[PDB]
Amino acid sequence: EQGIELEHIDSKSEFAHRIMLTNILRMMGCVKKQKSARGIETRPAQVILPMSPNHGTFGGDGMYSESKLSLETLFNRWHSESWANQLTVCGAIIGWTRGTGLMSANNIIAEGIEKMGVRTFSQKEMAFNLLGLLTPEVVELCQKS
Amino acid sequence: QGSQEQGMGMDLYKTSKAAQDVWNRADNHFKDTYGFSILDIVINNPVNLTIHFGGEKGKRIREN
């Protein structure tokens, strides 16, 4: 959702919010009901949520920032409800990932952001980082907290 | 040991309140200690049975 400011939030943004938040909750809800049906209490599914660090700080994103920030409620509800044996949350705050070439992402200003001391990532490095979160050590933490 | 048939004792588990206590107590202990239902084993007689050691309750079962 691009150049959708708060004046312009309509049908596309309300649908996007359903894709990116309410139907994410309904899909973890569904895997909890299927795992419980079969009394599976010891094989939790690690949910990896794509979070943003940038909630509202650009604008024109429609309800993207509302979508992203409301998944941070799952780090609290994991303690406060009855689905922690079925589900574990591993929220990944994904950072600057370069696309293909020139037009893709904002590739032309990557070099300039890196001069500040920030690091950007190839898609293959960002893939690496997120497959990190599925290693046996950080699967082990997820299941604690 | 000798006679060990599928569904053994399950006729008496439908009717009897006193049987039900015995099986339900045992089945809940095996589930929380060794991560399997003995009732599933007796009723269905599966060929394979994977215990999983995932989660707080799974690490406890793995220590057993």
PDB file of C-alpha atoms in Angstrom:
ATOM      1  CA  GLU A   1       0.000   0.000   0.000  1.00  0.00           C
ATOM      2  CA  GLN A   2       1.915   3.029  -1.365  1.00  0.00           C
ATOM      3  CA  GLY A   3       1.004   6.730  -0.852  1.00  0.00           C
ATOM      4  CA  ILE A   4      -1.994   5.662   1.237  1.00  0.00           C
ATOM      5  CA  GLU A   5      -1.962   8.324   3.984  1.00  0.00           C
ATOM      6  CA  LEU A   6      -4.628   8.437   6.774  1.00  0.00           C
ATOM      7  CA  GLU A   7      -7.030  10.514   4.559  1.00  0.00           C
ATOM      8  CA  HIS A   8      -7.041   7.581   2.040  1.00  0.00           C
ATOM      9  CA  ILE A   9      -7.281   4.410   4.193  1.00  0.00           C
ATOM     10  CA  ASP A  10     -10.111   2.491   2.427  1.00  0.00           C
ATOM     11  CA  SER A  11     -10.877  -1.047   1.161  1.00  0.00           C
ATOM     12  CA  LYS A  12      -7.376  -2.118   0.040  1.00  0.00           C
ATOM     13  CA  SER A  13      -5.859  -1.134   3.429  1.00  0.00           C
ATOM     14  CA  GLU A  14      -8.696  -2.817   5.391  1.00  0.00           C
ATOM     15  CA  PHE A  15      -8.106  -5.996   3.273  1.00  0.00           C
ATOM     16  CA  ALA A  16      -4.319  -5.722   3.672  1.00  0.00           C
ATOM     17  CA  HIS A  17      -4.798  -5.482   7.487  1.00  0.00           C
ATOM     18  CA  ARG A  18      -6.743  -8.801   7.317  1.00  0.00           C
ATOM     19  CA  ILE A  19      -3.956 -10.547   5.299  1.00  0.00           C
ATOM     20  CA  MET A  20      -1.148  -9.218   7.514  1.00  0.00           C
ATOM     21  CA  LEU A  21      -2.784  -9.405  11.010  1.00  0.00           C
ATOM     22  CA  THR A  22      -6.303 -10.848  11.695  1.00  0.00           C
ATOM     23  CA  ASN A  23      -5.882 -13.887   9.357  1.00  0.00           C
ATOM     24  CA  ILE A  24      -2.345 -14.450  10.821  1.00  0.00           C
ATOM     25  CA  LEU A  25      -4.064 -14.810  14.235  1.00  0.00           C
ATOM     26  CA  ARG A  26      -6.761 -17.098  12.705  1.00  0.00           C
ATOM     27  CA  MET A  27      -4.012 -19.352  11.178  1.00  0.00           C
ATOM     28  CA  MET A  28      -2.169 -19.720  14.555  1.00  0.00           C
ATOM     29  CA  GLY A  29      -5.635 -20.154  16.074  1.00  0.00           C
ATOM     30  CA  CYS A  30      -6.322 -23.011  13.609  1.00  0.00           C
ATOM     31  CA  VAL A  31      -2.971 -24.779  14.247  1.00  0.00           C
ATOM     32  CA  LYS A  32      -3.733 -24.622  18.016  1.00  0.00           C
ATOM     33  CA  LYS A  33      -7.186 -26.239  17.481  1.00  0.00           C
ATOM     34  CA  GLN A  34      -5.713 -29.031  15.232  1.00  0.00           C
ATOM     35  CA  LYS A  35      -2.776 -29.704  17.667  1.00  0.00           C
ATOM     36  CA  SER A  36      -5.149 -29.827  20.678  1.00  0.00           C
ATOM     37  CA  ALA A  37      -7.728 -32.062  18.933  1.00  0.00           C
ATOM     38  CA  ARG A  38      -4.906 -34.704  18.790  1.00  0.00           C
ATOM     39  CA  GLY A  39      -3.550 -33.877  22.297  1.00  0.00           C
ATOM     40  CA  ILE A  40      -0.152 -32.816  20.890  1.00  0.00           C
ATOM     41  CA  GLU A  41       1.272 -30.888  23.887  1.00  0.00           C
ATOM     42  CA  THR A  42       5.046 -31.330  23.265  1.00  0.00           C
ATOM     43  CA  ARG A  43       5.602 -30.374  19.566  1.00  0.00           C
ATOM     44  CA  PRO A  44       5.054 -26.606  19.347  1.00  0.00           C
ATOM     45  CA  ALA A  45       5.157 -24.710  16.019  1.00  0.00           C
ATOM     46  CA  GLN A  46       7.576 -21.747  16.113  1.00  0.00           C
ATOM     47  CA  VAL A  47       5.755 -18.797  14.462  1.00  0.00           C
ATOM     48  CA  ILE A  48       8.360 -16.394  12.833  1.00  0.00           C
ATOM     49  CA  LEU A  49       6.513 -12.982  12.522  1.00  0.00           C
ATOM     50  CA  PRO A  50       8.049 -10.378  10.238  1.00  0.00           C
ATOM     51  CA  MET A  51       8.139  -7.242  12.431  1.00  0.00           C
ATOM     52  CA  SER A  52       9.276  -3.759  11.360  1.00  0.00           C
ATOM     53  CA  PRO A  53      11.462  -1.431  13.467  1.00  0.00           C
ATOM     54  CA  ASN A  54       9.801   1.531  11.595  1.00  0.00           C
ATOM     55  CA  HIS A  55       6.144   1.920  12.924  1.00  0.00           C
ATOM     56  CA  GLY A  56       4.680   5.112  11.318  1.00  0.00           C
ATOM     57  CA  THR A  57       8.120   6.758  10.620  1.00  0.00           C
ATOM     58  CA  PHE A  58       7.620   7.011   6.756  1.00  0.00           C
ATOM     59  CA  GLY A  59       3.849   7.235   6.159  1.00  0.00           C
ATOM     60  CA  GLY A  60       2.032   6.396   2.928  1.00  0.00           C
ATOM     61  CA  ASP A  61       2.046   2.752   4.124  1.00  0.00           C
ATOM     62  CA  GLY A  62      -1.800   2.491   4.684  1.00  0.00           C
ATOM     63  CA  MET A  63      -2.451   0.230   7.681  1.00  0.00           C
ATOM     64  CA  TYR A  64       1.001  -1.556   7.370  1.00  0.00           C
ATOM     65  CA  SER A  65       2.430  -0.040  10.609  1.00  0.00           C
ATOM     66  CA  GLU A  66      -0.838  -0.931  12.528  1.00  0.00           C
ATOM     67  CA  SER A  67      -0.557  -4.505  11.137  1.00  0.00           C
ATOM     68  CA  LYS A  68       3.113  -4.843  12.180  1.00  0.00           C
ATOM     69  CA  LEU A  69       2.867  -3.272  15.648  1.00  0.00           C
ATOM     70  CA  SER A  70      -0.179  -5.348  16.739  1.00  0.00           C
ATOM     71  CA  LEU A  71       1.833  -8.655  16.333  1.00  0.00           C
ATOM     72  CA  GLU A  72       3.973  -7.460  19.327  1.00  0.00           C
ATOM     73  CA  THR A  73       0.819  -8.349  21.433  1.00  0.00           C
ATOM     74  CA  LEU A  74       1.691 -12.084  20.752  1.00  0.00           C
ATOM     75  CA  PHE A  75       4.881 -11.801  22.954  1.00  0.00           C
ATOM     76  CA  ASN A  76       2.604 -11.014  25.920  1.00  0.00           C
ATOM     77  CA  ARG A  77      -0.405 -13.247  25.123  1.00  0.00           C
ATOM     78  CA  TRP A  78       1.963 -16.287  24.920  1.00  0.00           C
ATOM     79  CA  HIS A  79       2.232 -15.980  28.776  1.00  0.00           C
ATOM     80  CA  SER A  80      -1.378 -14.960  29.363  1.00  0.00           C
ATOM     81  CA  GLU A  81      -3.415 -17.598  27.421  1.00  0.00           C
ATOM     82  CA  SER A  82      -3.579 -21.388  26.921  1.00  0.00           C
ATOM     83  CA  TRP A  83      -1.695 -21.875  23.606  1.00  0.00           C
ATOM     84  CA  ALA A  84       2.013 -21.748  24.647  1.00  0.00           C
ATOM     85  CA  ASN A  85       2.392 -25.589  24.378  1.00  0.00           C
ATOM     86  CA  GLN A  86       1.054 -25.464  20.792  1.00  0.00           C
ATOM     87  CA  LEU A  87       2.881 -22.305  19.508  1.00  0.00           C
ATOM     88  CA  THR A  88       6.032 -20.237  20.169  1.00  0.00           C
ATOM     89  CA  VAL A  89       6.663 -16.727  18.899  1.00  0.00           C
ATOM     90  CA  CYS A  90       9.968 -15.701  17.328  1.00  0.00           C
ATOM     91  CA  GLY A  91       9.564 -12.115  16.083  1.00  0.00           C
ATOM     92  CA  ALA A  92      12.204 -11.137  13.498  1.00  0.00           C
ATOM     93  CA  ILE A  93      12.723  -7.327  13.148  1.00  0.00           C
ATOM     94  CA  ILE A  94      13.902  -7.527   9.488  1.00  0.00           C
ATOM     95  CA  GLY A  95      16.166  -4.661   8.345  1.00  0.00           C
ATOM     96  CA  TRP A  96      17.421  -3.165   5.076  1.00  0.00           C
ATOM     97  CA  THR A  97      17.345  -5.928   2.417  1.00  0.00           C
ATOM     98  CA  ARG A  98      18.500  -4.911  -1.087  1.00  0.00           C
ATOM     99  CA  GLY A  99      16.424  -6.279  -4.043  1.00  0.00           C
ATOM    100  CA  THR A 100      17.470  -7.100  -7.671  1.00  0.00           C
ATOM    101  CA  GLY A 101      18.632  -3.833  -9.378  1.00  0.00           C
ATOM    102  CA  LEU A 102      18.175   0.003  -9.224  1.00  0.00           C
ATOM    103  CA  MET A 103      14.321   0.222  -9.049  1.00  0.00           C
ATOM    104  CA  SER A 104      13.897  -2.737  -6.596  1.00  0.00           C
ATOM    105  CA  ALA A 105      13.602  -1.531  -2.946  1.00  0.00           C
ATOM    106  CA  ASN A 106      15.589   1.754  -2.665  1.00  0.00           C
ATOM    107  CA  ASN A 107      18.871   0.226  -4.017  1.00  0.00           C
ATOM    108  CA  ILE A 108      20.322   3.614  -5.204  1.00  0.00           C
ATOM    109  CA  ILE A 109      20.472   5.030  -1.609  1.00  0.00           C
ATOM    110  CA  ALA A 110      21.765   1.751   0.051  1.00  0.00           C
ATOM    111  CA  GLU A 111      25.438   2.820  -0.497  1.00  0.00           C
ATOM    112  CA  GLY A 112      24.608   6.154   1.233  1.00  0.00           C
ATOM    113  CA  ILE A 113      22.864   4.596   4.284  1.00  0.00           C
ATOM    114  CA  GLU A 114      25.880   2.202   4.664  1.00  0.00           C
ATOM    115  CA  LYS A 115      28.202   5.296   4.897  1.00  0.00           C
ATOM    116  CA  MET A 116      26.364   6.163   8.226  1.00  0.00           C
ATOM    117  CA  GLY A 117      27.782   2.885   9.750  1.00  0.00           C
ATOM    118  CA  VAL A 118      24.515   0.919   9.143  1.00  0.00           C
ATOM    119  CA  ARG A 119      24.719  -2.463   7.353  1.00  0.00           C
ATOM    120  CA  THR A 120      22.351  -3.520   4.552  1.00  0.00           C
ATOM    121  CA  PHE A 121      21.897  -7.145   3.455  1.00  0.00           C
ATOM    122  CA  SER A 122      21.516  -9.184   0.283  1.00  0.00           C
ATOM    123  CA  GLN A 123      18.297 -11.239   0.210  1.00  0.00           C
ATOM    124  CA  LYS A 124      20.614 -14.322   0.669  1.00  0.00           C
ATOM    125  CA  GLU A 125      22.083 -12.801   3.923  1.00  0.00           C
ATOM    126  CA  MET A 126      18.576 -11.821   5.264  1.00  0.00           C
ATOM    127  CA  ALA A 127      17.535 -15.447   4.420  1.00  0.00           C
ATOM    128  CA  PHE A 128      20.522 -16.669   6.461  1.00  0.00           C
ATOM    129  CA  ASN A 129      19.613 -14.489   9.466  1.00  0.00           C
ATOM    130  CA  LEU A 130      15.973 -15.790   9.546  1.00  0.00           C
ATOM    131  CA  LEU A 131      17.149 -19.479   9.108  1.00  0.00           C
ATOM    132  CA  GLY A 132      19.279 -18.688  12.202  1.00  0.00           C
ATOM    133  CA  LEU A 133      15.940 -18.414  14.095  1.00  0.00           C
ATOM    134  CA  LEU A 134      15.145 -22.080  13.170  1.00  0.00           C
ATOM    135  CA  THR A 135      18.479 -23.486  14.505  1.00  0.00           C
ATOM    136  CA  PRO A 136      18.158 -25.870  17.503  1.00  0.00           C
ATOM    137  CA  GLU A 137      19.586 -23.211  20.000  1.00  0.00           C
ATOM    138  CA  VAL A 138      17.031 -20.385  19.264  1.00  0.00           C
ATOM    139  CA  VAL A 139      14.261 -23.047  18.856  1.00  0.00           C
ATOM    140  CA  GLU A 140      15.235 -23.979  22.474  1.00  0.00           C
ATOM    141  CA  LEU A 141      14.828 -20.267  23.755  1.00  0.00           C
ATOM    142  CA  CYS A 142      11.454 -19.681  21.917  1.00  0.00           C
ATOM    143  CA  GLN A 143      10.092 -22.709  23.905  1.00  0.00           C
ATOM    144  CA  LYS A 144      11.232 -21.076  27.233  1.00  0.00           C
ATOM    145  CA  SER A 145       9.991 -17.483  26.438  1.00  0.00           C
TER     146      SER A 145
ATOM    147  CA  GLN B   1       2.147 -61.850  30.397  1.00  0.00           C
ATOM    148  CA  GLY B   2       0.692 -63.773  27.409  1.00  0.00           C
ATOM    149  CA  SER B   3      -2.805 -62.693  26.235  1.00  0.00           C
ATOM    150  CA  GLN B   4      -2.357 -59.012  25.159  1.00  0.00           C
ATOM    151  CA  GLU B   5      -5.090 -58.226  22.562  1.00  0.00           C
ATOM    152  CA  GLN B   6      -6.140 -54.854  21.054  1.00  0.00           C
ATOM    153  CA  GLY B   7      -8.974 -53.229  23.086  1.00  0.00           C
ATOM    154  CA  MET B   8      -8.255 -55.428  26.192  1.00  0.00           C
ATOM    155  CA  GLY B   9     -10.206 -54.059  29.202  1.00  0.00           C
ATOM    156  CA  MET B  10     -12.006 -51.406  27.020  1.00  0.00           C
ATOM    157  CA  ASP B  11     -15.489 -53.064  27.349  1.00  0.00           C
ATOM    158  CA  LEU B  12     -15.158 -52.578  31.158  1.00  0.00           C
ATOM    159  CA  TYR B  13     -13.862 -48.960  30.557  1.00  0.00           C
ATOM    160  CA  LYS B  14     -17.141 -47.916  28.731  1.00  0.00           C
ATOM    161  CA  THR B  15     -19.425 -49.129  31.594  1.00  0.00           C
ATOM    162  CA  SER B  16     -17.451 -48.923  34.877  1.00  0.00           C
ATOM    163  CA  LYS B  17     -16.834 -45.635  36.756  1.00  0.00           C
ATOM    164  CA  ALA B  18     -14.141 -47.505  38.806  1.00  0.00           C
ATOM    165  CA  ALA B  19     -12.259 -48.782  35.699  1.00  0.00           C
ATOM    166  CA  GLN B  20     -12.423 -45.264  34.127  1.00  0.00           C
ATOM    167  CA  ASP B  21     -10.691 -43.835  37.258  1.00  0.00           C
ATOM    168  CA  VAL B  22      -7.837 -46.412  36.870  1.00  0.00           C
ATOM    169  CA  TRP B  23      -7.303 -45.892  33.107  1.00  0.00           C
ATOM    170  CA  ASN B  24      -7.804 -42.053  33.144  1.00  0.00           C
ATOM    171  CA  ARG B  25      -5.388 -41.674  36.110  1.00  0.00           C
ATOM    172  CA  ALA B  26      -2.740 -43.909  34.448  1.00  0.00           C
ATOM    173  CA  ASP B  27      -3.165 -42.374  30.938  1.00  0.00           C
ATOM    174  CA  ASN B  28      -2.704 -38.831  32.420  1.00  0.00           C
ATOM    175  CA  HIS B  29       0.440 -39.937  34.311  1.00  0.00           C
ATOM    176  CA  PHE B  30       2.001 -41.571  31.215  1.00  0.00           C
ATOM    177  CA  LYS B  31       1.119 -38.404  29.137  1.00  0.00           C
ATOM    178  CA  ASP B  32       2.819 -36.038  31.647  1.00  0.00           C
ATOM    179  CA  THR B  33       5.821 -38.331  32.368  1.00  0.00           C
ATOM    180  CA  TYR B  34       6.658 -40.316  29.184  1.00  0.00           C
ATOM    181  CA  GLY B  35       4.631 -38.305  26.599  1.00  0.00           C
ATOM    182  CA  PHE B  36       2.262 -41.055  25.416  1.00  0.00           C
ATOM    183  CA  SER B  37      -1.286 -42.267  26.207  1.00  0.00           C
ATOM    184  CA  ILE B  38      -1.368 -45.984  27.210  1.00  0.00           C
ATOM    185  CA  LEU B  39      -5.113 -45.875  26.150  1.00  0.00           C
ATOM    186  CA  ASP B  40      -4.171 -44.942  22.525  1.00  0.00           C
ATOM    187  CA  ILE B  41      -1.662 -47.883  22.602  1.00  0.00           C
ATOM    188  CA  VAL B  42      -4.320 -50.349  23.933  1.00  0.00           C
ATOM    189  CA  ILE B  43      -7.205 -49.129  21.662  1.00  0.00           C
ATOM    190  CA  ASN B  44      -5.362 -48.507  18.309  1.00  0.00           C
ATOM    191  CA  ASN B  45      -2.161 -50.707  18.638  1.00  0.00           C
ATOM    192  CA  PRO B  46       0.058 -48.444  16.443  1.00  0.00           C
ATOM    193  CA  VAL B  47       3.227 -49.868  14.742  1.00  0.00           C
ATOM    194  CA  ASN B  48       5.402 -46.781  15.552  1.00  0.00           C
ATOM    195  CA  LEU B  49       5.145 -44.088  18.287  1.00  0.00           C
ATOM    196  CA  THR B  50       7.293 -40.911  18.326  1.00  0.00           C
ATOM    197  CA  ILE B  51       7.575 -39.080  21.645  1.00  0.00           C
ATOM    198  CA  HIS B  52       8.475 -35.366  21.130  1.00  0.00           C
ATOM    199  CA  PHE B  53      10.590 -33.414  23.671  1.00  0.00           C
ATOM    200  CA  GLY B  54       9.417 -29.934  22.615  1.00  0.00           C
ATOM    201  CA  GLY B  55       8.427 -27.233  25.112  1.00  0.00           C
ATOM    202  CA  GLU B  56       8.692 -26.871  28.936  1.00  0.00           C
ATOM    203  CA  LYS B  57       6.595 -30.085  29.425  1.00  0.00           C
ATOM    204  CA  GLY B  58       8.719 -31.896  26.753  1.00  0.00           C
ATOM    205  CA  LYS B  59      12.128 -31.114  28.405  1.00  0.00           C
ATOM    206  CA  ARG B  60      10.657 -32.569  31.645  1.00  0.00           C
ATOM    207  CA  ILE B  61       9.506 -35.732  29.793  1.00  0.00           C
ATOM    208  CA  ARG B  62      13.017 -35.994  28.201  1.00  0.00           C
ATOM    209  CA  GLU B  63      14.725 -35.880  31.676  1.00  0.00           C
ATOM    210  CA  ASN B  64      12.498 -38.924  32.653  1.00  0.00           C
TER     211      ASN B  64
END
